[PDB]
Ligand SMILES: [Cu+2]
Ligand SMILES: [Cu+2]
């Protein structure tokens with residue numbers, strides 16, 4: 001009765017060293033009702049692009065939509081020219097080719113659009129995919145590795161639908177304040193699927209692909225999750241947890257034990273974020289059912305020491321929301337949903353960094369290349385959750401929202417929590433990003449990003465003094 005977990009195709013290079021991605025409109029079915037949806041190589045979501053460290057691939061991207069889009073590789077340490085930020089326009093009916101020279105450790109990354117002012121809508125319509133980066137090191141570890149059997153991607157997303165079955169997306173005053181969220185949870189595009197897994201260890205590559213909703217994964221029968229990797233790759237050793245908070249755009253890979261004759265659910269637990277604890281999410285909600293079919297590593301990798309903080313450039317990034325949006329938006333939330341919404345209290349340019357709404361034509365600063373910087377990101381004076389994402393890098397978190405990072409969050413990350421307090425990350429950019437293809441740094445609550453909470457930055461030379 002439960003549908004099976006859809007498994008994205010694991011896509012590798014052809015004999016020409018090319019991967020073809022087609023962006024296009026189609027249809028999907030949710031709870032019996034048809035909806036217009038968009039996908040990469042299909043109707044919804046996308047494949048998993050498989051990349052090998054030290055090898056180049058060329059991706060041909062065909063935009064068969066009737067509007068512009070871009071294709072950003074979230075978590076990839078590549079040059080601005082192929083980063084697919086807002087300046088990476090792919091015309092409707094057109095094609096753009098990018099060569100990815102992969103040079104970072106094994107990791108589960110992802111890809112999605114980054115079209116200026118419309119990223120939230122384009123993701124909500126269905127556009128997201130995965131990146132599986134492998135290297136020599138990870139293959140020696142004997143992790144579960146049968147793609148779609150015991151090594152399974154799990155993209156978790158909410159949507160809401162109107163009466164006619166169609167996806168009901170709006171960038172309005174309420175969503176620009178608290179984000180777009182819905183009442184229906186999807187798992188690789190399916191509602192509450194089941195996955196058949198071999199007895200032993202199941203590897204789940206978890207992605208929060210929601211526009212705005214934070215998630216908190218756990219198991220129905222309280223069996224633990226062993227986190228083996230974060231956004232940017234393997235942790236030094238497994239970290240046992242009973243629950244796992246995952247912000248929008250973050251990935252974690254976990255190992256969970258599968259025992260004969262004991263089905264259980266992966267679930268998501270209620271979170272404190274405004275709007276996100278409305279029914280059906282006021283209680284633990286199922287994500288998928290694991291069905292055992294009657295068919296743990298000590299050390300995973302090495303995590304280098306944090307470099308000395310002395311003499312590193314510090315960049316301050318002050319996040320803000322115009323008081324007018326903050327009160328009107330929160331008022332709309334509370335009036336519609338009431339106390340359950342838990343409101344802890346022109347909009348197109350009302351969300352800001354350092355007093356400025358995103359300017360695509362004027363990068364705010366030029367970072368140094370090949371040098372560690374200390375970026376201090378503040379949400380002081382605003383109660384909203386901002387998962388802050390910096391392009392072109394995998395960084396280390398020094399401080400996360402006023403505390404040292406939890407052990408499973410102390411490795412390689414591209415996202416950091418900012419909520420009412422201040423975070424500090426240690427970041428290095430190995431590749432060029434010029435003014436014409438700048439790197440983005442932004443809140444990954446997509447409606448904030450789309451209404452100004454993003455900056456462009458360049459990377460070019462730095463160390464000549
Ligand atoms: Cu990104
Ligand atoms: Cu706010």
Ligand SMILES: [Cu+2]
Nearest residue numbers: 386443445448
């Ligand atoms: Cu935000």
Ligand SMILES: [Cu+2]
Nearest residue numbers: 079430431432
């Ligand atoms: Cu480079």
